[model samples]
Structures are given as structure tokens and as C-alpha cells.
Target: KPVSLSYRCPCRFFESHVARANVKHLKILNTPNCALQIVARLKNNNRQVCIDPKLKWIQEYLEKALNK
Candidate 1:
């Protein structure tokens, strides 16, 4: 994750969530005040350039890990 990239905010790695562990997703766990800033950046990015996919089998695990 790099702040100098087109998206200023780095992708987050939530080590341990409220329900599970290591569930990677398109989530930003930084302070709430930056939500709008991040969303705007996501909206402007080129769709063809970025995509992060998770395995279907890990969906539930992700749900648990992302519940924080």
C-alpha cells in the first residue's frame, strides 16, 4: 500500500477483526473523518487498473474478519 499512488490512502490490512482474523477486503479502517476522502479517490480510479478478488470459499471468513 502506497500513499503516493493515485489513491492517496493505502489499502488497509485489518490484522484481527471483531469476528475473525485476516479477512482481506476493500475496507478502510482508518479514522472516520477520512471516509469521504477515500471514497472520492476510489470513485476516480480507472476500473481496468485495480481489482482485488477473494476466493468464494473465504466469503464467510471475510465477513467475520470484516465485522469490526
Candidate 2:
């Protein structure tokens, strides 16, 4: 399977990371203005990256964890 990196910014155009694998983990360190601050790992390279979420799917997952 081919892996492609992608993101949503709650807008028509977002961003992506080419040749990147799945996000292994998304850690929401804090909530600023009720939004999320996230850190994540790429599955294949194990590279750590920061994510803003911006009302994307991962944001939803992060929110669920915080609520629990």
C-alpha cells in the first residue's frame, strides 16, 4: 500500500507531508482557546511532528481522549 500524508485546516485547502506514513500517536498536550495542541509520530520513519488539528479527524480523536 502506498502511504500519503494529509491534513485538513477547516478550509478548502490544507496541507500534506509527502512519503510519510500513518500518524502513530497524537498527544494533545493542552487546550488553547478550546482548541488542541498536538504532537505525533510517523509510523514508517518514526519522525515526530506537531499537528494543529484544525477541526480534522485527529482532532476529534484527541478530544475524545481528553473527555475521558
Candidate 3:
């Protein structure tokens, strides 16, 4: 697929917290681009899941991921 502008807006979040092992990738959607804040790709089924970035655990997890 050619690189083009796209949107990942969602109506609801899939989860409040997802185990670190289950997440294959992370995308920060805390902007006006998407309806939701945090989105992650699952390792098992490669599904895009919406998560609340406000979760305390989510903040800790992202801090670690960002440093290394």
C-alpha cells in the first residue's frame, strides 16, 4: 500500500490494561488524529486494540519502553 494519510478513530476502548507480553507494538494516539488515546497491536492475532492511556500501569509501561 502506498503511503497516504489515514485515520484510526474508534468509538470505544477495547481494554483498560493489556499485559506487556500481549502487545506487539504501540502507537500513541493522544492527539486530534484519533478518537482514542492509546492503541496497541497484539502479538497473538495482530489485532489493533484500544487502551486508555490514563491507566497508571500504562504510564509505567510506556516509560520503560521509551527509555530502552
Candidate 4:
């Protein structure tokens, strides 16, 4: 049988206590069968949010998470 994976937003950096924030896409990277990069900006400010799965497990998790 094949394995399963779970996906959730990363750490508390996405959480806000002072104001509401959102993400906007600039570009996305992908392999033939996997996601590689995600670039976006905080809708509430000028902050940039760039995500890349560095670990093998992280990349695997993202594959499943994104597919779901």
C-alpha cells in the first residue's frame, strides 16, 4: 500500500496578533511530480513570504498536502 501525508501551514509566523494578513502569489515552482517553491507577499503589508521545502520529508508532505 502507498503511504499518506498531511499538510498544514508552517509555524506561527503566519499567525497575527496585531492585524489580519493574507497571501498573494508571485510565482510557483514545481517538478514533474512535486511542488518546489512558493513566492508571495503579505496582503496586509510589504512583507514577502517565500517558501521552499528543504527536507525530503517536507517535500513529500507538500506533495500529498497539495494534492489533497
TM-score of each: 0.20, 0.51, 0.58, 0.31
Candidate 4 regions exceeding 4 Å error are 1-21, 30-35, 52-68
Error of 3 at 44 (Å): 1.4
List candidate 1 segments past 4 Å from native: 1-52
lDDT of 2 by residue, 1-68 (tens): 43334432222222335122477765555544344456667787676566656645665665577687
Expressed as tens digits, the lDDT of each residue in 1-68 for candidate 1 is 53544444343432221221222224433444323111111333322111222433335534665684
Model 3: per-residue Cα lDDT over 16-46, one tens digit each: 6577688898887655655447778889979
The deviation in Å at residue 68 for candidate 3 is: 8.1
- True-structure RMSD, every candidate: 12.5, 10.5, 6.5, 13.1
Error of 2 at 59 (Å): 2.6
In model 3, how large is the Cα lDDT of residue 40?
A: 80
Cα error of candidate 4 at position 35, Å: 7.2
User: Which regions of candidate 3 fall more than 4 Å away from where they truly are?
Assistant: 1-11, 33-36, 62-68
| Alpha-carbon lDDT of model 3 | 0.71
Better of 1 and 4 by TM-score: 4
Residue pairs with clashing backbones, model 4: none
1-68 in candidate 4: lDDT tens per residue? 43335433322132222221255434344543444555456677666665545645445556776798
Clashing pairs in 3: none
Number of the top-ranking candidate, with lDDT as the measure: 3
